[PDB]
Write a protein that binds this ligand. Sequence first.
Ligand SMILES: *[C@@H]1O[C@H](CO)[C@@H](O[C@@H]2O[C@H](CO)[C@@H](O[C@@H]3O[C@H](CO[C@H]4O[C@H](CO[C@H]5O[C@H](CO)[C@@H](O)[C@H](O)[C@@H]5O)[C@@H](O)[C@H](O[C@H]5O[C@H](CO)[C@@H](O)[C@H](O)[C@@H]5O)[C@@H]4O)[C@@H](O)[C@H](O[C@H]4O[C@H](CO)[C@@H](O)[C@H](O)[C@@H]4O)[C@@H]3O)[C@H](O)[C@H]2NC(C)=O)[C@H](O)[C@H]1NC(C)=O
Ligand SMILES: *[C@@H]1O[C@H](CO)[C@@H](O[C@@H]2O[C@H](CO)[C@@H](O[C@@H]3O[C@H](CO[C@H]4O[C@H](CO[C@H]5O[C@H](CO)[C@@H](O)[C@H](O)[C@@H]5O)[C@@H](O)[C@H](O[C@H]5O[C@H](CO)[C@@H](O)[C@H](O)[C@@H]5O)[C@@H]4O)[C@@H](O)[C@H](O[C@H]4O[C@H](CO)[C@@H](O)[C@H](O)[C@@H]4O)[C@@H]3O)[C@H](O)[C@H]2NC(C)=O)[C@H](O)[C@H]1NC(C)=O
Lengths: 210, 212, 123, 123
Amino acid sequence: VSAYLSRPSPFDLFIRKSPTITCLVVDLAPSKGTVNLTWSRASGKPVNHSTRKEEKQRNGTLTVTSTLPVGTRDWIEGETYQCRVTHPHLPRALMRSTTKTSGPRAAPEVYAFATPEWPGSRDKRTLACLIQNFMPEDISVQWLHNEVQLPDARHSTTQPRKTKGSGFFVFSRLEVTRAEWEQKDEFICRAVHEAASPSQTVQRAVSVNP
Amino acid sequence: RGVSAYLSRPSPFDLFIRKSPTITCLVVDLAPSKGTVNLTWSRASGKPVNHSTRKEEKQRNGTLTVTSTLPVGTRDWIEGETYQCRVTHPHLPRALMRSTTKTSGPRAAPEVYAFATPEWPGSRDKRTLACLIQNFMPEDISVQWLHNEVQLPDARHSTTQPRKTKGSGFFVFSRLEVTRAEWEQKDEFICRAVHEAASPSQTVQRAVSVNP
Amino acid sequence: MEVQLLESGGGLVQPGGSLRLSCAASGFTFGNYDMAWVRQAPGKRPEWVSSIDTGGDITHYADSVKGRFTISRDNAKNTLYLQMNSLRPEDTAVYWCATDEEYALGPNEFDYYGQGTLVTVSS
Amino acid sequence: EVQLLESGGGLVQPGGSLRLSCAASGFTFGNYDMAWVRQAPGKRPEWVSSIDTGGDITHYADSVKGRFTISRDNAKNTLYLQMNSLRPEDTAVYWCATDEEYALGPNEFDYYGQGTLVTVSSA
Ligand SMILES: *[C@@H]1O[C@H](CO)[C@@H](O[C@@H]2O[C@H](CO)[C@@H](O[C@@H]3O[C@H](CO[C@H]4O[C@H](CO[C@H]5O[C@H](CO)[C@@H](O)[C@H](O)[C@@H]5O)[C@@H](O)[C@H](O[C@H]5O[C@H](CO)[C@@H](O)[C@H](O)[C@@H]5O)[C@@H]4O)[C@@H](O)[C@H](O[C@H]4O[C@H](CO)[C@@H](O)[C@H](O)[C@@H]4O)[C@@H]3O)[C@H](O)[C@H]2NC(C)=O)[C@H](O)[C@H]1NC(C)=O
Ligand SMILES: *[C@@H]1O[C@H](CO)[C@@H](O[C@@H]2O[C@H](CO)[C@@H](O[C@@H]3O[C@H](CO[C@H]4O[C@H](CO[C@H]5O[C@H](CO)[C@@H](O)[C@H](O)[C@@H]5O)[C@@H](O)[C@H](O[C@H]5O[C@H](CO)[C@@H](O)[C@H](O)[C@@H]5O)[C@@H]4O)[C@@H](O)[C@H](O[C@H]4O[C@H](CO)[C@@H](O)[C@H](O)[C@@H]4O)[C@@H]3O)[C@H](O)[C@H]2NC(C)=O)[C@H](O)[C@H]1NC(C)=O
């Protein structure tokens, strides 16, 4: 048995402006009882209504996912939220807690590239975006075309990883079809992050043909 | 149960370039030192097992790591032998077992693309080089950077974990920072990928330069 | 649970012939997973062939094989089937059955592959 | 679990001196290398100095060499940074940091404290 607790995405925090934190319980050999999870603060202030989802996995694992909408000001000013998990066949309750990561702040730099054409794929091209020089680790990367955000599934973005003195970095990879670039030859890589200025977003556009 | 064990496959660099593949068994022990960890190497086939080395060290947070490495036959591994690492410790109720063999399934050679980041304010003595390795499978790959015809230390660069593309093969990104002295010395940096299905000699590479 | 998939049914057939591939499942509850078939012809990049629904209501095919092959499964026998009709030289390949923990209906880098079997279409 | 609490910030005139104390709690302090980092208004963070586990190894950035002195006392679980010959350029928020793997040099540290403010001006 294992339990995890997330932080809000920057997209939730700064673009939608309605951050939410998710407590995730992954339960191998399940269904002896019912998992009870309780949201709480360190400060003791009221907690909003939480959603709760139970899903059975293909391998027979049960996952319990609960998500709490949190106050925008409360999180920014360093509030601490705790998820405490009770189940009858668990010996002692599992407790996880979360808060804004302290420490210095650094704006991302965004660079977007287009791979050369390769035989076998002249009706699609691979777009690659590099986001680097930022900290904390939390970042959300987004792709926009004809002024509309693409579905998340269209692209895949690497987990953040250290550079040993330059900040964190991530890469984004997107596959675009010929019809899309014939329609409009502009694809926009946008990063949402705390230390970006002026509106917590920085972006760069790339085009298949210059 | 507070203890966890992991078992690797040979790296493509060890298997195909160095030509001495090795598999490493890793036991990570929280709240340790009640006894002594005994792990025994075995095969499914039952053939002799080579002599294995052992390294045990304490972590900063007080966790114990026990690492054992076994040299495996080049012929045996390619032709599908199955190796098992069996972990014994006195405070474990039942021994932990992990096993490994080459991943089955179709195979596709990488494509390599290497780029040079634009100049960035703040340093005239450094530039970031970025290499994209994609469209390959299985996941197992080793990525290397060469300058002045010699391989750079592993610590010089950082390479993303392999991740799916939903029908086009796996992909990884590599990031390297090069100094002014190096490119002034020779402005050619080569991104080289080692992979099983790369042909002709299990290698594919692309060169990149700071100044066109 | 450990995923074991064993193909059978390969061989040599004349063009225009037909063949039935059987993939036997063991070590997991077969009735919970979507299934697919993948092939790689000699010296060509791997190509996803077909995929099946959990219950069997959904079938997907690549255009190259559409209307020639028909996929099916029997959940009580823990066995996946691919029925191949009207074979062409184009279809000589090694065939694998596959499945994935998340997505199996479409082409993907599947988590699990079987051992594969060979189909040689020639005179 | 690593909890780091800075103290000792304040306001001083150019040429003055101020002493920063970072209190450690919740882990075996004697096993970790320690470092100090600062961020001046509208500037990217700058690694300042770092200390060895035993105290034998000291490193300093070129900007602060010979002006600052880092130290630690392991029995009191306290890290210190002594700043002499302060300049307006040194106005920043200061954090103490540590990492599970590498702490001697500039790095994206795993753990940071809460920070404290140092203002060097004519006042
Ligand atoms: C049977 O099968 C099931 C499969 O479902 C399997 O159960 C899984 O088990 C593992 C662990 O055992 C679980 O993996 C964990 O996943 C946690 C969930 O992370 C998700 O959400 C993260 C947070 O998202 C929120 O916040 C971000 C911003 O913070 C925001 O953008 C979002 O909108 C959202 O609000 C998210 O980061 C994460 O996404 C990344 O990672 C996934 C992983 O592949 C990848 O797909 C994405 O591309 C993306 O890069 C994900 O979406 C996660 O918190 C946790 O990570 C911590 O722990 C590991 C382990 O130490 C650390 O390495 C890591 O640094 C983190 O500290 C961990 O990865 C998995 O989630 C279970 N199931 C499901 C449904 O998720 C069973 O194991 C199988 N059976 C057996 C026997 O194993
Ligand atoms: C107290 O501190 C200690 C130490 O900090 C900490 O202990 C860690 O505990 C976690 C789990 O709890 C361990 O996590 C596992 O790490 C495994 C080790 O992976 C290493 O080796 C891998 C294999 O290398 C061989 O093969 C490759 C080619 O295959 C070849 O190149 C090599 O030469 C070698 O022969 C290797 O893949 C891996 O490298 C990746 O990860 C590092 C992480 O920094 C990254 O830097 C690399 O760039 C690369 O991405 C690494 O070198 C690993 O096998 C294992 O992975 C499984 O689990 C994860 C999560 O479930 C899955 O996502 C994954 O798919 C695997 O199933 C997992 O990551 C960790 O290793 C310990 N650290 C050490 C140093 O031992 C304690 O947790 C701390 N205490 C507390 C209470 O938290």
